[PDB]
Scaffold this active site. Structure first.
Site, PDB file in Angstrom:
ATOM      1  N   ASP A 174       0.812  -1.215   0.000  1.00  0.00           N
ATOM      2  CA  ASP A 174       0.000   0.000   0.000  1.00  0.00           C
ATOM      3  C   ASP A 174       0.864   1.292   0.000  1.00  0.00           C
ATOM      4  O   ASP A 174       0.328   2.393   0.110  1.00  0.00           O
ATOM      5  CB  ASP A 174      -0.928   0.020   1.223  1.00  0.00           C
ATOM      6  CG  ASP A 174      -2.040  -1.067   1.187  1.00  0.00           C
ATOM      7  OD1 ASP A 174      -2.172  -1.843   0.205  1.00  0.00           O
ATOM      8  OD2 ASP A 174      -2.801  -1.122   2.188  1.00  0.00           O
ATOM      9  N   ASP A 195      -9.024  34.913 -34.262  1.00  0.00           N
ATOM     10  CA  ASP A 195      -8.676  33.554 -33.908  1.00  0.00           C
ATOM     11  C   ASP A 195      -9.812  32.981 -33.097  1.00  0.00           C
ATOM     12  O   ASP A 195     -10.302  31.911 -33.373  1.00  0.00           O
ATOM     13  CB  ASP A 195      -7.390  33.534 -33.066  1.00  0.00           C
ATOM     14  CG  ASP A 195      -6.132  33.392 -33.892  1.00  0.00           C
ATOM     15  OD1 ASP A 195      -6.164  32.792 -35.008  1.00  0.00           O
ATOM     16  OD2 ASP A 195      -5.090  33.842 -33.365  1.00  0.00           O
ATOM     17  N   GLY A 245      -6.988  19.991 -34.058  1.00  0.00           N
ATOM     18  CA  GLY A 245      -8.033  19.205 -34.742  1.00  0.00           C
ATOM     19  C   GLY A 245      -8.532  19.761 -36.063  1.00  0.00           C
ATOM     20  O   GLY A 245      -8.991  19.016 -36.931  1.00  0.00           O
ATOM     21  N   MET A 246      -8.506  21.075 -36.213  1.00  0.00           N
ATOM     22  CA  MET A 246      -8.867  21.653 -37.493  1.00  0.00           C
ATOM     23  C   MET A 246      -7.785  21.344 -38.525  1.00  0.00           C
ATOM     24  O   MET A 246      -8.087  20.930 -39.649  1.00  0.00           O
ATOM     25  CB  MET A 246      -9.050  23.165 -37.371  1.00  0.00           C
ATOM     26  CG  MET A 246     -10.118  23.545 -36.266  1.00  0.00           C
ATOM     27  SD  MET A 246     -10.190  25.309 -35.761  1.00  0.00           S
ATOM     28  CE  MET A 246     -10.485  26.087 -37.372  1.00  0.00           C
TER      29      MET A 246
END
Ligand code: SF4
Ligand code: SF4
Lengths: 425, 440, 440, 425
Positions: free
Chosen positions: C36, C294, C429-430
């Protein structure tokens, strides 16, 4: 009863060099290869303007000239041969397009002369388009490429009777399909399109055919079809907006003696689906700093949408080619009780910024050079270039135009009640 | 005639514009056809500028070939003078200006008679220099010019400041992480007890320039911009310079020792050695990183490095000397300054690559199959095609390479940033290989 | 009995250890079987700690079931006392300690008779609280205890400092970007002209605690840790608190206005309003980002947000209110504090998700197909499987989420970092969608 | 002539809970599913210890017990049924392995009893392995799983004559292939391996077969094969290192009465290819804080490599099972003139850190809990766990062991002449 007013300024304004047309045209003509004969100045522009596409192994390259090329210490024909051969090896294109450039003009390089010779030796068609910043703006690049293409079009060798119609203007395939199938509902055949998907698919164009423009900047291409190809030009407003699209069709049908069946409804249906964008657009002012030649027809659309247009800036105005589009604008100004706007050819961006400052328009349509400086001054802006690559033609794309024009309007809503709109240095 | 579509360094005029845009009230005007003004698009986009870019085009259209390009240039200079009232206007030759060969020097001579603004022609030539050399020269040119005005007017402040102070030379618009490097550099000076006399190009006024000789010395952080100016001040004023880019732990320590020598040589009486120990153990984590098990796992892993002279040489020495990485090759696109590069990296990579052809760089990445790449946006895109992580260290950079978060590369915090950038590129590629190895 | 393999919040004992490890000379000892002690692995790896983690295990082996687990505990306490000489030792119940039910309270009573160190038993129970609640309680417990010692010894420093000053409460080991948040917070206080009285848990000494009432008020930056302690000081001392997480532009401004009210209420005579304007325009770039083209390109783009209460609520309000993003759902795994969450995010997302099952979160990402995800490492991995970018905003975090580069989330620089984190996830992602659209 | 010295400390040391064996065993047994019946304490360990594999949809889950399970307010058999059924639905495994946990021990949950019942009702084999921190360390987990598997092995129902040999110990497939094909060169058949690639492929094991251990921590599994399966155990040193590998083979062949043909050379060739790692390793000291039971055999390897071993820490020592490996160590100490090291069972990490401080060894082999604190103090460290998942068995993998042991030595070289080795807070 008093008409549009036309003015002309210093030609001191921002716009994309016409060599940018390689970016969408190489994308459009699948087996082409665009060789731009120019300098690092040109290369730097394209590398930066075409953003992410520069990493997609484009079918485009600069033929970058050395000091030896400028002084003719190196033989221009021999230089073009060695590297047009490299191109044939590694890409096996069906046409190489030479983009003449400012440098090639000033040093007088006979591209139009060298091309037919080099073509023969090498096996591949070479098309010259003298698309330079000396002579032309942005989308005019495509006009100089398509005029040159028109000379290469082959010759002769359910629908209504009508003679062959051939439409001209590069558009995304989805928008060709949509427009072609829009005329198909009126019983009009599209025998071909000037640029097809492949250079090898250029349409037949025989003496007697009809042609129609789909974009406002295609003057030279139209002039060429009439004079060199012997075609009849249907002058019509351009199918941008649902008003544009219906007028465009009505005018084609009229040339052919056809009653346009079932489209008053097709228009209303399109307008109705735009209720929410029209609520936003209603009553607000717009200022077109000119830069891409779409401006006469976007202004005309936006006036029917309920906006006040304060200035229509334009690089170049062909009153002959636009004629019908200009007639539709003035009539639109009358039907909406809008005072006839003034069209500023070859505008002065500096002066224009003074006028914008004075007028405080709700929307400035403009380039990336002025957008952030404007926003920071509290003027809302929409960057103009997006209008050239978004799908904006036909009924199904009138929404797209408005998504574009309202975008800054929507960001205004979402960010209201936070006192920092005017925050300059 | 060469076939290409990618270039690492732009046309000469870009460097002059970057210089003009970094000062206040300096307006560049470019003798150029319609469209060569894309510099303004770039400035406004990448730097997200709130102010208009002070760069206008005296247009060259056909009516120029006919003794044009030499009458609007005077008109456009004076009109810019009156509308914007700059301190200095800088006439800017392009590739076009280069092959019409008109007496630009003359218009400048003429125009400066009718304008309140001073006028210069950038002593720069498209076919002989690139963006960086042009910027280096332009910056020297303006310093010299205003040094000269001070002298002939009697205002040349020539007495050294009472307490040691420095000029920071070479901070530029569109310069890779320059704004942050600048803040990191002023902070270091302040911690060292050194007043900052002047920071040039960036945000300086032309009227400040005459205060330059009042610095005890000059610090030039970047190999490529400011050397010329530091050298002129040495020969005119006996003003020493420190040109050691404080980028990385070992190089930061050098820079600071050099400053130590140069100041004690003029009587400062200063030892920085305790400052260097204290920063290296307490503020930088990079020394500690090098000892840690994280770094131990990187020993012997292969990297390639490509960029400009400053960042590729500094990166190469951080990888090898500070982290035990195996740099198979390091390269630069600053061909005109290749010898400096080869010397800086000798003994830090197996091989040196000097080229400005991206396809030579790409093929040299595929053949070597490194575990990570440190390069430009184009090397980042090769990494994506090849499934290899890449940390971006030098220009051709994109908007994501202009953060508003504090990201210096220089100085002690800069060492902290380079650790993350490096450990993250290595670990992203390991974690990916493991995912696939296990499932997906 | 529930089937799971991922959990967002750890066992109760983790919170107590994190508290013990944040003070100096406080040694946690865990009543637990062999193994632990993985907490030490985690501390040393994620925080790259140069010092041993002051957490030992009083082992529970079988010989424990036989009145074990209650004789070594005394021996192990005293041995730790003598070897390490801590100020405080904290006996630490686990899941095992929980079902043997031995008089731990007694050993602590006994052990503290033989040890120089003070001794406590963490008032925490595996089956009733998680890591965060445990840490919240433990921190209160220690403050109260030492407040009590001060009182009974007569050393309770009870007079407020001459100039306004503050206690910063809740900065913790293994806390998401805590070390940087702490530096960002001390800097803000310094700029506001407020002395910092004490920073607790992190790096504090138990002997400092009695100085707590000398603060004019208390600032609690994180929802989940320190509330308890701020409240106790209010009722015992009338010490007001500001619990507005200064995370983002609008929330940073709130925090600072609240501080303004609380101090003027005790006679400070201070207006911060010019400070807020000046920081918002000049130091933060986030306001300017919101106006820029932007950010305009992001309007209406879809995001989902998932994390702990503090970061998911602050992120949700930054996305909607400051950037015009469409947050389809925002969620938290702090179920026990769900009502606070729903109220914080009301009107900032379409839907609220309250769960601690990662597969419910995953399915809710697939169904909505956002353009970007802001979540934990597990949401980052869903993004990879689904080809969607993800910015990591909350714990379960990995080593790359403990940068040595300066990355606060709070305060004015924190606003700068959040802009980059957000703009970068959307743009990655774009740029990817465009690559594929064009070629590869 | 004076032998190894064995000591035993408090058992207060760091090591991975034996439930970690699910991580490599689920990876090894392809159609298995490991259900760990435990708490959030256990879940937290595995989620963190298995790093990136936790995002690969592992065939492992916690059966996380509620307060209702601890008080028997919920019926344990019914609870296990509902979720073992979920498992069968979504994974269709060929065996479910229950990992008994500390909690299950303390509350006395009859897994061994409930399993055969639940198995019958559900159609799937259930294997119980009581692998908990109460009783066992790290790699001992696999021993408790494999012992339990041994009971499930089916019964009976160019090489030399020799009776069936079956080897036991989970290894990566590449290392099975390599070891199997190492015996194939001696004319020894490997009839099977205890764990095979699929639970459905467990080898036959009839009364009379021979078995051999491939890893030092497989005591229980060995005991089980002898007593419950009726097999002969070839006690041999483990094939870790090229000395290990040759002795391992020599001893197998010897049991079967075979002269090992052509391997004095196969060893020298392996040693020769390690010249460069041996130059580094020569003369330096090592300290094994114990944690994974490989330690007797790594120490023995590293002494033949020329190192001084200062302490061999070990969780647990089976003198019967290791016997031959312990005999090879002492003999190795004699041949290299190295004084017999002491083996510390159940060590005290605290005390050990005092000894390390006193001795300043060149290499401490140890866990991630102590590594960074040590490095910061100038002691070089190698994290011990990597030895459990790197390929380290057979001739071809002796290099791998050394890459591991020299890694911190190489980083020392690359970073020499930079005064910051001892830099604590
Ligand atoms: S304007 Fe002329 S010089 Fe400039 S990029 Fe365009 S073609 Fe090249
Ligand atoms: S030691 Fe016991 S309680 Fe701890 S993780 Fe291991 S099985 Fe669970």
């Amino acid at each position: 009863p008093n008409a549009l007013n036309f003015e002309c300024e210093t030609g001191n304004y921002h716009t994309f060099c016409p060599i940018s047309c390689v970016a969408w045209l190489y994308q459009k003509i699948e087996d082409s290869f665009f060789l731009v004969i120019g300098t690092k100045t040109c290369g730097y522009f394209l590398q930066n303007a075409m953003g992410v596409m520069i990493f997609a192994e484009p079918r485009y390259a600069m033929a970058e000239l050395e000091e030896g090329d400028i002084s003719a210490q190196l033989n221009d024909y021999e230089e073009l041969k060695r590297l047009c051969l490299e191109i044939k090896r590694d890409r096996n294109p069906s046409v190489i397009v030479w983009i003449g450039t400012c440098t090639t003009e000033i040093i007088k390089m006979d591209l139009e002369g060298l091309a037919p010779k080099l073509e023969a030796e090498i096996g591949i068609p070479i098309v010259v388009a003298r698309a330079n910043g000396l002579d032309y703006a942005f989308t005019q690049g495509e006009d100089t490429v398509l005029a040159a293409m028109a000379a290469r079009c082959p010759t002769s060798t359910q629908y209504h009777p009508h003679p062959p119609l051939v439409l001209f203007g590069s558009l995304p395939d989805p928008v060709v399909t949509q427009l072609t199938l829009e005329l198909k509902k009126q019983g009009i055949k599209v025998s071909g399109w000037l640029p097809a998907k492949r250079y090898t698919e250029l349409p037949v164009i025989d003496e007697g055919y009809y042609v129609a423009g789909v974009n406002p900047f295609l003057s030279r291409t139209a002039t060429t079809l009439i004079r060199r190809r012997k075609c009849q030009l249907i002058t019509a407003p351009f199918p941008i907006g649902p008003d544009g699209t219906r007028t465009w069709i009505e005018q084609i049908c009229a040339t052919f003696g056809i009653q346009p069946q079932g489209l008053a409804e097709r228009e209303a249906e399109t307008w109705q689906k735009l209720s929410d964008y029209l609520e936003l657009v209603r009553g607000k002012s717009v200022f077109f700093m000119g830069d891409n030649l779409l401006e006469i027809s976007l202004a005309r659309f936006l006036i029917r949408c309920g906006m006040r247009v304060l200035e229509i800036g334009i690089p170049y105005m062909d009153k002959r080619y636009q004629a019908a589009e200009l007639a539709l604008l003035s009539q639109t100004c009358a039907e909406m009780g809008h005072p006839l706007p003034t069209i500023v050819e070859k505008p002065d961006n500096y002066n224009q910024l003074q006028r914008i400052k004075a007028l405080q328009p709700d929307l400035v349509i403009t380039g990336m050079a002025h957008a952030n400086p404007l926003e920071a001054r509290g003027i809302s802006t929409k960057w103009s270039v997006e209008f050239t690559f978004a799908q904006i033609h036909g009924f199904g794309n009138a929404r797209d135009i408005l998504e574009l024009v309202t975008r800054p309007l929507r960001r205004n809503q979402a960010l209201a009640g936070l006192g920092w709109q005017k925050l300059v240095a | 005639m060469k076939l290409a579509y990618w270039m690492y360094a732009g046309p000469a005029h870009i460097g002059t514009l970057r210089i003009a845009s970094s000062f206040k009230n300096v307006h560049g005007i470019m003798h150029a056809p319609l469209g060569d003004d894309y510099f303004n698009v770039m400035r406004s986009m990448l730097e997200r500028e709130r102010d208009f870019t002070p760069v206008t085009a005296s247009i060259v259209d056909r009516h120029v070939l006919a003794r044009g390009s030499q009458e609007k240039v005077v008109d456009n200079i004076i009109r810019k003078d009156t509308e914007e009232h700059p301190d200095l206007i800088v006439l800017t030759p392009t590739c076009t200006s280069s092959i019409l060969q008109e007496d630009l020097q003359n218009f400048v001579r003429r125009a400066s008679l009718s304008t309140t603004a001073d006028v210069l022609l950038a002593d720069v030539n498209h076919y002989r220099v690139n963006e960086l050399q042009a910027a280096d020269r332009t910056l020297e040119q303006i310093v010299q010019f205003y040094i000269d005005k001070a002298r002939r007017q009697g205002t040349l402040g020539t007495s050294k400041t009472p307490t040691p102070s420095v000029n920071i030379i070479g901070i530029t618009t569109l310069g890779f992480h320059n704004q942050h490097d600048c803040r990191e550099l002023k902070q270091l000076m302040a911690d060292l007890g050194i007043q900052v006399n002047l920071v040039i190009p960036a945000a300086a006024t032309v009227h400040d320039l005459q205060r330059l000789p009042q610095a005890w010395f000059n610090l030039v952080p970047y190999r490529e911009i400011g050397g010329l100016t530091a050298q002129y001040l040495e020969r005119e004023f006996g003003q020493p310079s420190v040109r050691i880019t404080p980028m990385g732990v070992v190089e930061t320590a050098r820079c600071i020792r050099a400053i130590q020598g140069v100041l004690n040589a003029q009587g400062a009486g200063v030892n920085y050695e305790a400052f260097i120990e204290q920063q290296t153990r307490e503020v930088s984590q990079a020394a500690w990183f090098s000892r840690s098990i994280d770094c131990q796992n990187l020993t012997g892993k292969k990297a390639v490095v490509f960029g400009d002279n400053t960042h590729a040489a500094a990166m190469t020495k951080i990888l090898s000397r500070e982290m035990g990485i195996h740099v198979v090759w390091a390269g630069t696109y600053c061909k005109y300054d290749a010898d400096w590069f080869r010397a800086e990296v000798a003994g830090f990579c197996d091989e040196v690559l000097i080229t400005d052809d991206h396809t030579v760089v790409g093929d040299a990445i595929a053949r070597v199959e490194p575990a990570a790449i440190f390069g430009t946006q184009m090397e980042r895109h090769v990494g994506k095609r090849l499934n290899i992580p890449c940390g971006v260290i030098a220009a051709p950079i994109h908007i994501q390479d202009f953060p508003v978060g504090y990201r210096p590369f220089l100085g002690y915090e800069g060492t902290n940033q380079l650790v993350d950038l490096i450990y993250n590129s290595f670990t992203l590629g390991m974690e990916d290989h493991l995912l696939e190895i296990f499932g997906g």
